[PDB]
Design a binder for this molecule. Structure first.
Ligand SMILES: CO[C@@H]1O[C@@H](C)[C@@H](O)[C@@H](O)[C@@H]1O
Ligand SMILES: CO[C@@H]1O[C@@H](C)[C@@H](O)[C@@H](O)[C@@H]1O
Ligand SMILES: CO[C@@H]1O[C@@H](C)[C@@H](O)[C@@H](O)[C@@H]1O
Ligand SMILES: CO[C@@H]1O[C@@H](C)[C@@H](O)[C@@H](O)[C@@H]1O
Ligand SMILES: CO[C@@H]1O[C@@H](C)[C@@H](O)[C@@H](O)[C@@H]1O
Ligand SMILES: CO[C@@H]1O[C@@H](C)[C@@H](O)[C@@H](O)[C@@H]1O
Length: 266
């Protein structure tokens, strides 16, 4: 493959970060807990990976969706070892909210994106069905109400929007190429959204802050992209993991331009 494929999540304000990399059929994990990157416990087969996580109090819960073929296995971290989850259904994208939690997993397969849903009481097939060869997702809560944005790429990236009772076509536009791969993050209540697109070896960034999409400052090489972000008070921090070949570079936004991070594969 022209590059490894990554997925990233983060929690708290330290923060802790976990980056999962699929390389030649194996997924491994690099970890940050404030004091240097290190190799994590996670090791499972897969050509494709997505991740979501949530806190209950101080306890992290992580779900990693590892795909080989149309067989996607969910791996669970709930404080004591990676365990096999109940998910059944590929390129995937995952999001979660609340503390139950609710999870949504989107799978692009043979040009179609479909959705699997967990609301505490088993997996079911969701209402979402849209064309796409590649999918990314982000979501946010506004009080009790969930908002989901799915970025479906075919031939053009279309944004699909859930805001309480149905999927609607969003205002997102970009300049894309066939085969493009995206990653998305969001923060606050407006919200702000950032969508990163890898198009023929270049990653660019489209931005929403409440009143239209604009082209962001991020511009770095890569065939594959993942992203995570966290707030410290009102200040956003973003980490973008850009891969070309087996080289993954972390790019950092901490309020004052994009800078190179300490991330290594080691
Ligand atoms: C303490 O263990 C580390 O952190 C956990 C939350 C997991 O990411 C695990 O794979 C890693 O080795
Ligand atoms: C309690 O069940 C476990 O956690 C849920 C949040 C889901 O990830 C499910 O597939 C997994 O088996
Ligand atoms: C209530 O409907 C379910 O949850 C929503 C948040 C969406 O994920 C929808 O596609 C799904 O069927
Ligand atoms: C209000 O506008 C809708 O929600 C925003 C958060 C964006 O996702 C935008 O593209 C979409 O049309
Ligand atoms: C104000 O600048 C915009 O927002 C920042 C949080 C970054 O996403 C940057 O690339 C973008 O152009
Ligand atoms: C302070 O260190 C910077 O931020 C951390 C949260 C990590 O993303 C690290 O790789 C980066 O160099």
């Amino acid at each position: 493959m022209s590059s490894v494929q990554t997925a990233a999540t983060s929690w708290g304000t330290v923060p802790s970060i976990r980056v999962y990399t699929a390389n030649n059929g194996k997924i491994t994990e690099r970890c940050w807990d404030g004091k240097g990157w290190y190799t994590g416990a996670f090791n499972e087969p897969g050509d494709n990976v997505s991740v979501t996580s949530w806190l209950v109090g101080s306890a992290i819960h992580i779900r990693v969706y590892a795909s080989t073929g149309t067989t996607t296995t969910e791996w669970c971290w709930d404080g004591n070892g990676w365990t096999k989850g109940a998910y059944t259904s590929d390129q995937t994208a995952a999001t979660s909210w609340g503390t139950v939690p609710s999870i949504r997993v989107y799978t692009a397969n043979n040009g179609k994106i479909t959705e699997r849903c967990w609301d505490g009481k088993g997996w079911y097939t969701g209402a979402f069905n849209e064309p796409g060869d590649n999918v990314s997702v982000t979501s946010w809560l506004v009080g009790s109400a969930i908002h989901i944005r799915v970025y479906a790429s075919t031939g053009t990236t279309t944004e699909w929007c859930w805001d309480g009772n149905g999927w609607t076509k969003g205002a997102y536009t970009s300049s894309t190429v066939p085969g493009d791969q995206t990653a998305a993050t969001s923060w606050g209540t407006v919200p702000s959204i950032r969508v990163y697109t890898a198009n023929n070896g270049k990653i660019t960034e489209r931005c929403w802050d409440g009143k239209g999409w604009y082209t962001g400052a991020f511009n770095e090489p890569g065939d594959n992209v993942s992203v995570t972000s966290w707030l410290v008070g009102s200040a956003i921090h973003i980490r973008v993991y850009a891969s070309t070949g087996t080289t993954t570079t972390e790019w950092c936004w901490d309020g004052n331009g994009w800078t190179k991070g300490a991330y290594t594969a080691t």
